[PDB]
Design a protein around this nucleic acid. Structure first.
Ligand SMILES: [Mg+2]
Ligand SMILES: [Mg+2]
Ligand SMILES: [Mg+2]
Ligand SMILES: [Mg+2]
Ligand SMILES: [Mg+2]
Ligand SMILES: [Mg+2]
Ligand SMILES: [Mg+2]
Ligand SMILES: [Mg+2]
Lengths: 52, 88, 117, 104, 63
RNA sequence: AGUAUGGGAGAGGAUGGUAGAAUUCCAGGUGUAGCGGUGAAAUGCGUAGAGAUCUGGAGGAAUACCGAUGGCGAAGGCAGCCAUCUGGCCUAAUACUGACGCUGAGGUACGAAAGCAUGGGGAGCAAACAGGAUUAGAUACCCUGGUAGUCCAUGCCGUAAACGAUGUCUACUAGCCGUUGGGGCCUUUGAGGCUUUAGUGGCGCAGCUAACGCGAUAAGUAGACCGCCUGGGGAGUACGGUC
C-alpha cells in the first residue's frame, strides 16, 4: 500500500475518519501496519482528512 | 561505514589462503577496521549506550581471537599486531 | 428588529448543567437559556426535564426573529441531550440535522486525578 | 547515491511559475550528476483541510537519485521558497519508473 | 454524525438514528475515559484482564 | 563456537525538522442573567458584562483512532510523521578458522520514580500551603486556588513488590489448541492445506511437590560455575571504614 492509493485508503477508514481495526476487516498484521503508515502519510499530505 | 569493497580489500590483504574468510587474521583485521570506524560516530553521539554495548562486544571478541592466535603461534600474533598497529 | 431565516442551536450538555444558545450563521448570538436560571436548582439541574424547559424557553425567545429552519450542534455528555432537540422540534422549528461536535484531544494535557470517594 | 521521492504543494496563485522552479531543480540535479527517475504534475487540487488559510494546492511529484549534499540543498531551497508549502521527502530503494496513480 | 433529515422524517426517528450513529462512533466513550487520569500500571492491568476475558470467551464459543 | 556473501520484521538507541486535535491565556464581534462545583452545600468566578458562540493571535506539553495473550531491547525501558548516524535479531545455500568454549571471587559499565548542583522554560497536573465543607474532634478522604516538581542542556545520586518473589549455560522426556517473523511442499479461482525454525500464550500424560501447583518457556531427569540461608525480635540497627 502507498499513500497515493486513496481509494483503498478510504476503504479502511470510518466516516469520522478513524482507522478501522484489523479484527473487523480480517486484514493481516503486516498489511494493517503498512495501511496505517500510508494513511498517516496521506493525512500529512492532505489527501484525506485527519478527522470529521 | 565500511562498504563491501572495503571489507573485500581487507580480506584480500590479510587472507592466508585463497577464499579464506574465517581465519583469525582476517577476523581481527575486520574487527579493528570496524572499531576504528565507529570512533567518529561515538564522538558525536556520546550518549548512545545501546550502540556502545555492541562496540564493546566487538572489542572483547578481538581480544579473545588475539589471545587464541598468540597461544597457537607467536610469530603470527607478532606479525598481526605489527600490521594492525595494536599494542597487544 | 433584525430578521434571519436560518439559525443554529448549540446545546452544551454537561453532567451538572445544560445550556442552549441560538446563533445566526457566522455564530452571532440571538437568544439563550439555561436550566439553572429556570428553577431546578440543585440535583434537579441535570435532569432532562430542566433541559427541555430551557430548550422551549430559548426557542420561544428566538421566535421573535422569524427563523423557521434550524441546525443543531451538540457537544458534551449528560442527561437532557435529546430532550433539548425534542423540545426544539416541538416548538415548530425544522431541524435540518443533528451533529456531535464534542472535542476530543489526541493525548494532550494531563487529566485531573481520580477521586477517592 | 540514494533514491528519494519528493511531493510538493505549491500555492495555487503562483502555479504559473511551477514549470520554472522544477526546471531549475532538474538543472541543479543534473549539474551535480544525479538521475531524474520520475516527474509528474497532478494539477491543482481541493485540499482535504485548509493549510495556511488556503483551500487549493498545486501538486508535484518527483523521483530523484542524488547525493547527501544535493539532498540537503533541495531541503533548504524548499524551506525558503514561499511558493512551496507542505513538501515531503521519502527515502526509497530502487528507482520506480511506472506511471503513478492519481496522475490525471 | 451528519444525520441529514429526510423530507418527512419524524423528529423522534431522527433522534433515534442520531443515537445509533453516536453509539456506533463511540464518542461518549472517549469523553468518559478522559474524565480522570489513570496510572500506566492500571491501564496495563485492565488490558491484560480484557485479553484473558476475550480468550476465555473465544474458548467457550469454540467448545 | 566464530567469519564473508543474498534477503526480512521491528515504539532498539542518538540528533534535527515538521503535522493535526485539544487545554490555558490575550484581544475583538454578538448577547445578558447567571456560571462553576457537591451526596447536599459552601469557597470561588460574573452587571466594571461572566458562562455560551464566532474570529484573530501567544506559548508549553503529549501523540486519539491503528493497538493486539502484538513487537523490540541484557535489564531499566521503548508510541504521531520525515531525514541523518548507529547496535542487535531472524532467515537460505554455499565457502572458510579449527575447541578459538561455559561460568565467574575481586573489578568495571548501565541502571524506573523521587531527590541534589548550574542555566533556561513553564500550558495542564500537582507534594507544601491557603480558604470552604463533613465530623465530637479533621492536620485527612470531598470542593475552590496553588508553590517546588513534572519539561530542556550538562553532571551527580545507585535506590524499588528493580517480580516470573523462579541465576547463567548445556543434552534428554506423551500429546492438543492459538498467535508473531522466516524457510519448504501441494492446491487452484486467488486465497488456502500441510510441514519445519526462532519467539509469545492456553490446557495436559508421566515425573516432581507439605499443599497450592509446575509440567519442552519444568519447579521433571542429569552435568559445569557462581550468589545466597540457618527460630522470631534487637537490626540492615550501633561502632569502624569507603563512596
Ligand atoms: Mg474536581
Ligand atoms: Mg537531546
Ligand atoms: Mg561480583
Ligand atoms: Mg550513570
Ligand atoms: Mg534491594
Ligand atoms: Mg519493571
Ligand atoms: Mg528479590
Ligand atoms: Mg546503615
Amino acid at each position: 500500500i502507498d499513500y497515493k492509493d486513496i481509494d483503498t485508503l478510504k476503504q479502511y477508514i470510518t466516516e469520522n475518519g478513524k482507522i478501522v481495526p484489523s479484527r473487523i476487516t480480517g486484514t493481516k498484521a503486516r498489511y494493517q501496519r503498512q495501511l496505517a503508515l500510508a494513511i498517516k502519510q496521506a493525512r500529512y499530505l492532505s489527501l484525506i482528512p485527519y478527522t470529521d | 561505514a565500511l562498504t563491501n569493497a572495503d571489507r573485500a580489500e581487507i580480506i584480500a590483504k590479510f587472507a592466508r589462503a585463497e577464499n579464506d574468510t574465517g581465519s583469525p587474521e582476517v577476523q581481527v583485521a575486520l574487527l579493528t577496521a570496524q572499531i576504528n570506524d565507529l570512533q567518529g560516530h561515538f564522538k558525536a553521539h556520546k550518549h548512545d549506550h545501546h550502540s556502545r554495548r555492541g562496540l564493546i562486544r566487538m572489542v572483547n571478541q578481538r581480544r579473545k581471537l588475539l589471545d587464541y592466535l598468540n597461544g597457537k603461534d607467536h610469530e603470527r600474533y607478532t606479525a598481526l599486531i605489527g600490521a594492525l598497529g595494536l599494542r597487544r | 428588529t433584525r430578521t434571519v431565516s436560518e439559525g443554529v442551536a448549540h446545546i452544551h450538555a454537561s453532567f451538572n448543567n445544560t445550556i442552549v444558545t441560538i446563533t445566526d450563521r457566522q455564530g452571532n448570538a440571538l437568544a439563550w437559556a439555561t436550566s439553572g436560571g429556570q428553577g431546578f436548582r440543585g440535583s434537579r439541574k441535570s435532569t432532562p426535564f430542566a433541559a427541555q424547559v430551557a430548550a422551549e424557553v430559548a426557542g420561544k425567545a428566538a421566535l421573535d426573529y422569524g427563523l423557521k429552519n434550524l441546525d443543531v450542534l451538540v457537544k458534551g455528555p449528560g442527561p437532557g441531550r435529546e430532550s433539548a432537540v425534542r423540545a426544539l422540534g416541538a416548538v415548530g422549528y425544522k431541524i435540518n440535522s443533528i451533529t456531535d461536535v464534542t472535542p476530543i484531544p489526541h493525548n494532550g494535557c494531563r487529566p485531573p486525578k481520580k477521586r477517592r470517594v | 547515491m540514494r533514491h528519494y521521492e519528493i511531493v510538493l504543494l505549491v500555492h495555487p496563485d503562483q502555479s504559473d511559475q511551477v514549470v520554472g522552479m522544477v526546471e531549475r531543480y532538474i538543472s541543479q540535479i543534473k549539474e551535480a550528476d544525479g538521475q531524474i527517475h520520475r516527474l509528474e504534475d497532478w494539477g491543482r487540487r481541493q485540499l482535504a483541510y485548509p493549510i495556511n488559510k488556503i483551500h487549493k494546492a498545486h501538486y508535484i511529484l518527483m523521483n530523484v537519485e542524488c547525493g547527501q549534499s544535493t539532498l540537503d540543498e533541495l531541503e533548504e531551497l524548499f524551506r525558503y521558497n514561499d511558493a512551496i508549502i507542505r513538501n515531503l521527502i521519502i527515502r526509497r530503494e530502487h528507482a520506480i519508473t511506472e506511471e503513478s496513480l492519481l496522475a490525471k | 454524525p451528519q444525520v441529514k433529515l429526510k423530507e418527512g422524517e419524524p423528529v423522534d426517528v431522527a433522534i433515534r438514528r442520531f443515537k445509533r450513529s453516536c453509539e456506533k462512533a463511540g464518542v461518549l466513550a472517549d469523553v468518559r475515559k478522559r474524565e480522570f487520569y489513570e496510572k500506566p500500571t492500571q491501564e496495563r492491568k485492565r488490558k491484560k484482564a480484557a485479553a484473558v476475558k476475550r480468550y476465555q470467551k473465544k474458548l467457550a464459543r469454540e467448545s
